[PDB]
Amino acid sequence: DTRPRFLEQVKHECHFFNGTERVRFLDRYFYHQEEYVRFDSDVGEYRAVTELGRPDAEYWNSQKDLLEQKRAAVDTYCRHNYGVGESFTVQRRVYPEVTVYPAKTQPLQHHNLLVCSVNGFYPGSIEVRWFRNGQEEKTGVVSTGLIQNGDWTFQTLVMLETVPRSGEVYTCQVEHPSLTSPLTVEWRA
Amino acid sequence: EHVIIQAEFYLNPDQSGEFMFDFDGDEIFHVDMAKKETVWRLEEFGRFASFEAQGALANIAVDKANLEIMTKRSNYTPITNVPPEVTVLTNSPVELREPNVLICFIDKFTPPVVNVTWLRNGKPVTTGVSETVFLPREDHLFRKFHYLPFLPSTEDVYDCRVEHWGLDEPLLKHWEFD
Amino acid sequence: AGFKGEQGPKGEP
Ligand SMILES: *[C@@H]1O[C@H](CO)[C@@H](O)[C@H](O)[C@H]1NC(C)=O
Ligand SMILES: *[C@@H]1O[C@H](CO)[C@@H](O)[C@H](O)[C@H]1NC(C)=O
Ligand SMILES: *[C@@H]1O[C@H](CO)[C@@H](O)[C@H](O)[C@H]1NC(C)=O
């Protein structure tokens, strides 16, 4: 199918700063990928983002009842949905499962990668660090970055490029908002 | 410090429509348009809240009407296809004989139409597969996840195959044990 | 217990 496509998107966004103490509401309209008009609660009227949206800004701003509905959305839409969802979204906590395992950079070279695999956590902010015999190892660290699993969990792998020496002990340290204290996992050759 | 987005789209000529809520990049629910039903991303959520699916259908009808307007206002300028990037990973470190899930993450694409097949030793597989709807990105392209529960073995190789109108040929992304 | 959908207006016809 080579027929041309045409796409309309609308995103009604609610931005929360310190819970519901500071709330910004944005109504945004897009044609393909291009935002053409939006209602910002910081402004309290619609504004054309591109020339394509000028007739809608004008038209919609001439409707006083529409503006007043949208001027109220920080309260009747955003604060309301925040209250509905907070317990299982804002307050969702899911502990990181931590696994250390060795691996190889160039296939079939003695193990020279220690992998700290951190799985199934929520929310996303995490800090993973590596230690060799009590010293942080800051060189030789590469990571996948933060990966979203799409099921309200995250994972990340954090790798230490190293040539392990017998009786050296390596520690993977994980700090996350779900924990009261850092989680630590050790490995020895 | 958080963002809730009610994201909607309507696509011609396909007459496809979508309605979903996103919290910090995670889907809370979407509305199955055919079934007129709210579908929770996690089961648990349905016990903590509700949503009336009929509102979504009303919004989509406005989105369809606005698309017709904007299509003419644009002089029928169509969308430019942006092909996806695709990545295949597991949800947990892999152990022979330990059940796991392969994830196929399709991102940065538009329009929101894709064919995705999971392949085992080159043959399509459908048993136990699941998928998300199209998720919005901040750059107004889309993202999507497909899942395949599996038992790892040195005997099997997998690919996630993705077709999209911006690709010259299907993109296959490979996975195997090692 | 109920999430609210925000509605939107119809464009300049
Ligand atoms: C957030 O709001 C609380 C009261 O709800 C207040 O005590 C606190 O100072 C606020 N945080 C800021 C603005 O630093
Ligand atoms: C569409 O064409 C009209 C002339 O008929 C012109 O004024 C307008 O700028 C064009 N708009 C586009 C390409 O968005
Ligand atoms: C998916 O497959 C159908 C035929 O089954 C095809 O006509 C359609 O264009 C495909 N969509 C793609 C490649 O995005």
Side-chain angles (χ1 to χ4, degrees), chain A residues 1-105 107 109-187 189, chain B residues 1-96 98-154 156-178, chain C:
Chain A
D1 193 331
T2 78
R3 281 179 296 169
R5 258 62 189 183
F6 311 89
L7 180 70
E8 178 82 3
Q9 314 182 64
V10 188
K11 314 186 181 182
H12 313 272
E13 305 188 357
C14 289
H15 300 256
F16 300 91
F17 311 86
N18 192 40
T20 61
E21 168 184 71
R22 161 73 209 183
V23 183
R24 190 190 201 198
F25 166 72
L26 295 158
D27 243 24
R28 300 176 75 189
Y29 290 79
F30 308 85
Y31 178 64
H32 314 325
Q33 267 182 91
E34 160 197 348
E35 191 178 2
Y36 59 93
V37 69
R38 72 159 65 165
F39 172 98
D40 190 343
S41 63
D42 278 16
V43 177
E45 301 191 327
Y46 285 94
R47 289 292 178 264
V49 184
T50 65
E51 182 66 39
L52 216 51
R54 295 204 208 287
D56 302 333
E58 296 179 14
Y59 180 48
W60 297 339
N61 286 341
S62 78
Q63 306 174 43
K64 73 192 189 198
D65 49 341
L66 177 60
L67 297 180
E68 289 297 329
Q69 218 98 68
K70 301 284 170 190
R71 281 164 193 177
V74 286
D75 297 324
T76 61
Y77 174 60
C78 303
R79 276 170 182 106
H80 176 84
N81 289 336
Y82 191 95
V84 171
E86 182 197 5
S87 60
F88 59 93
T89 64
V90 172
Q91 294 189 60
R92 179 172 173 90
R93 299 277 144 129
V94 186
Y95 93 114
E97 314 193 343
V98 179
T99 292
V100 175
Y101 70 87
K104 296 168 165 201
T105 50
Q109 251 196 177
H110 306 249
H111 297 315
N112 65 332
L113 222 40
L114 289 182
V115 184
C116 187
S117 180
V118 192
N119 298 81
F121 58 96
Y122 190 99
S125 58
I126 197 153
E127 187 78 18
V128 184
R129 309 218 268 272
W130 269 111
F131 299 75
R132 186 180 53 184
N133 299 309
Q135 312 294 311
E136 187 169 357
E137 272 303 338
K138 312 193 132 187
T139 81
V141 179
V142 70
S143 174
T144 55
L146 189 65
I147 298 157
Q148 260 202 299
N149 295 321
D151 64 349
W152 292 78
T153 67
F154 294 85
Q155 57 174 303
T156 183
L157 308 182
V158 187
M159 306 178 251
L160 183 63
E161 299 161 343
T162 187
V163 185
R165 259 166 255 212
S166 191
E168 288 178 327
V169 168
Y170 288 91
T171 315
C172 184
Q173 189 191 265
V174 181
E175 294 172 281
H176 181 253
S178 74
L179 307 168
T180 73
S181 174
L183 197 46
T184 279
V185 178
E186 289 193 339
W187 185 96
Chain B
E1 196 37 62
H2 294 293
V3 188
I4 300 182
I5 299 184
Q6 175 182 323
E8 287 162 39
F9 74 73
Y10 192 84
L11 178 60
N12 278 333
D14 310 68
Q15 308 190 131
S16 298
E18 192 188 282
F19 181 106
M20 65 85 70
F21 273 60
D22 176 294
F23 174 83
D24 294 354
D26 266 308
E27 178 184 352
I28 301 180
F29 68 89
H30 74 270
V31 172
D32 175 316
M33 295 286 141
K35 303 188 165 183
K36 305 200 202 308
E37 278 171 45
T38 303
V39 180
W40 297 94
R41 180 58 185 88
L42 306 185
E43 288 275 276
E44 95 179 45
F45 295 170
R47 288 190 285 286
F48 287 79
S50 51
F51 180 75
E52 164 55 66
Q54 191 56 226
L57 312 191
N59 275 29
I60 290 298
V62 171
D63 296 340
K64 174 186 198 310
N66 292 336
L67 178 58
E68 288 159 32
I69 293 158
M70 301 307 309
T71 295
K72 319 182 207 239
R73 207 187 285 158
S74 82
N75 308 325
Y76 301 84
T77 301
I79 198 159
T80 299
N81 298 315
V82 177
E85 290 165 29
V86 176
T87 308
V88 170
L89 36 84
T90 60
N91 83 316
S92 67
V94 176
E95 269 185 333
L96 289 174
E98 315 293 285
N100 202 316
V101 182
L102 275 160
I103 304 158
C104 180
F105 175 49
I106 310 150
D107 186 35
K108 289 169 206 161
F109 69 94
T110 203
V113 185
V114 80
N115 292 327
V116 177
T117 315
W118 287 109
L119 301 171
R120 208 205 307 268
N121 306 321
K123 306 132 159 268
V125 296
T126 68
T127 281
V129 302
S130 57
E131 72 190 74
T132 68
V133 297
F134 300 97
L135 313 169
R137 289 168 53 77
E138 290 181 78
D139 58 10
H140 317 308
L141 301 174
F142 297 89
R143 46 172 165 140
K144 196 188 201 301
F145 297 82
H146 284 245
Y147 303 104
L148 172 59
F150 76 113
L151 258 188
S153 76
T154 44
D156 296 318
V157 302
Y158 295 85
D159 303 281
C160 178
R161 188 176 67 202
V162 175
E163 309 151 41
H164 184 270
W165 292 320
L167 288 169
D168 298 298
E169 47 187 28
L171 194 38
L172 276 78
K173 225 73 195 189
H174 193 73
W175 185 92
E176 75 201 359
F177 188 89
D178 265 345
Chain C
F3 284 113
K4 287 199 193 137
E6 178 68 13
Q7 291 163 254
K10 204 179 81 83
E12 182 96 81

